[PDB]
Design a protein around this ligand. Structure first.
Ligand SMILES: CC[C@H]1OC(=O)/C=C/[C@H](C)[C@@H](O[C@@H]2O[C@H](C)C[C@H](N(C)C)[C@H]2O)[C@@H](C)C[C@@H](C)C(=O)/C=C/C=C/[C@@H]1CO[C@@H]1O[C@H](C)[C@@H](O)[C@@H](OC)[C@H]1OC
Ligand code: HEM
Length: 393
């Protein structure tokens, strides 16, 4: 009676038709995931937003529950495993340092990196793999700039970081070795910065105070690694997916070449439209019985609040399946909602905007080097995107 879940096919960005049918007939429904417990699935924009904003729906039980999921291992902890007040405290300290102004201050460096990456692509000649040469490189290098990793260390830092991607084909031990290198490295960088602060985010996080409170040694380190993993694969996959869409929908590419000022609005529209998740990770747990759409979610039950379906809800977004780069209003949930609302979203916006800006400026004829039906899609089962994007220009 619960439906097998996920509904999305990983081999593309299509939004499963089941979502729409549930938004109509059964907006709070039961699902059976590949691993973990059966759960409620919530699919209407209004309800998804209500769930993510509601104090009765928490993340703490993640730590001691068999979470609905698509992979056998569970990845636990981070800010997203915490609830107020402990969550509020850490978030207050982080946002104090990681401000929208810091995010925008990185646009010039983000563009310089994007141009170097395009130089490297042009230097090896068509076809180049946009995924390996650009999408997997820009967001970790920008995180390097953000944190304060000295330039000479960007290559080894990038190399360790690649082992954390869900698409990586490394043994357990290899990934383990990259994880120890990155922790050790970040720990030392934090300690330098503490005694000799610069202008980078690690310096500002060490000096962040909130009515006499500060981040502990371990907190600093877990938060810095936490930003790395939250900010790398997401951004990488979304760059790949946006460019795949640009290269396969000529009217989208023509609109942005003609009017590059539309790039920020287009980033928002594609963040809405792309159901980036294979499913919905990060189940919330009811702290008490909650009745939603006349159905009672009981205390302790997991609830998957689908931002992919919510962002494509016809009740909230006129002609929701149309990509309209000027769409307004566009109050999408592509960066989340409520206390866990993506804290890197200003910088993600900067990076996505820069990626499209530089690629379009440098390679206005960029297009697929192989037929669309021949693309290989990631089977990492967390996010959807192409494994390789051979491009010509
Ligand atoms: C797709 C995005 C996520 O990717 C992930 O969740 C990454 C998952 C990969 C697939 C895992 O690696 C796999 O583990 C298996 C046991 C073996 C398998 N191989 C080697 C055959 C291997 O590929 C995990 C265990 C990798 C380790 C290094 C890890 O902790 C990765 C963390 C990355 C988390 C990524 C970011 O999500 C963040 O997860 C945190 C737990 C949350 O608190 C939150 O913010 C910090 C969230 O981002 C919003
Ligand atoms: C296109 C790129 C990105 C997308 C689509 C994205 C999306 C999201 C979403 C939907 C959430 C909320 C998850 C939930 O509530 O279940 C989230 C949380 C988070 N994101 Fe992002 N994100 C992106 C980039 C980034 C970047 C670049 C960073 C950091 C530099 C970042 C750091 C974080 C952190 C630390 C959280 C958890 C916040 C908390 O629990 O308080 N994200 N992101």
């Amino acid at each position: 009676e619960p439906r097998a879940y996920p509904f999305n096919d990983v081999h593309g960005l299509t939004l499963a038709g089941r979502y729409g049918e549930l938004q109509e007939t059964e907006p709070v429904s039961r699902v059976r995931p590949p691993y973990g417990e059966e759960a409620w699935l919530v699919t209407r924009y209004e309800d998804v937003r209500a769930v993510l904003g509601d104090g009765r729906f928490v993340r703490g039980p993640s730590m001691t529950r068999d979470e609905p999921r698509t992979r056998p291992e569970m990845v636990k902890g981070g800010l997203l495993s915490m609830d107020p007040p402990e969550h509020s405290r850490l978030r207050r300290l982080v946002v104090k340092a990681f401000t929208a102004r810091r995010a925008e201050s990185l646009r010039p460096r983000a563009r310089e990196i994007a141009h170097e990456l395009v130089d490297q692509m042009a230097a090896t000649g068509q076809p180049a793999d946009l995924v390996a040469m650009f999408a997997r490189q820009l967001p970790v290098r920008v995180i390097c700039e953000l944190l304060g990793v000295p330039s000479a260390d960007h290559d080894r830092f990038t190399r360790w970081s690649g082992a954390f991607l869900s698409t990586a084909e490394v043994t357990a031990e290899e990934m383990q070795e990259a994880a120890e290198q990155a922790y050790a490295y970040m720990g030392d960088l934090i300690d330098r910065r503490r005694k000799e602060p610069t202008d980078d985010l690690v310096s500002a996080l060490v000096q962040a105070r909130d009515q006499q409170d500060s981040l502990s040694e371990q907190e600093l380190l877990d938060l810095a690694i936490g930003l790395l993993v939250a900010g790398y694969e997401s951004t990488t996959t979304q760059i790949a997916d946006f460019v795949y869409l640009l290269m396969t929908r000529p009217e989208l590419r023509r609109q942005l070449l003609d009017r590059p000022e539309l790039i920020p609005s287009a980033v928002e529209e594609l963040t809405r439209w792309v159901p980036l998740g294979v499913g919905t990770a990060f189940p919330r747990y009811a702290v008490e019985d909650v009745t939603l759409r006349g159905v009672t979610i009981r205390a302790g039950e997991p609830v998957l609040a689908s931002t992919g379906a919510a962002n494509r809800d016809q009740a909230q977004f006129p002609d929701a399946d149309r990509i309209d780069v000027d769409r307004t209003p566009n109050q999408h949930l592509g960066f989340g909602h409520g206390v866990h609302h993506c804290l890197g979203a200003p910088l993600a916006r900067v990076e996505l905007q820069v990626a499209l800006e530089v690629l379009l400026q440098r390679l206005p004829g960029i297009r697929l080097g192989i037929p669309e039906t021949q693309l290989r899609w990631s089977e990492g089962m967390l996010l959807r995107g192409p494994l390789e994007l051979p491009v010509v220009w």
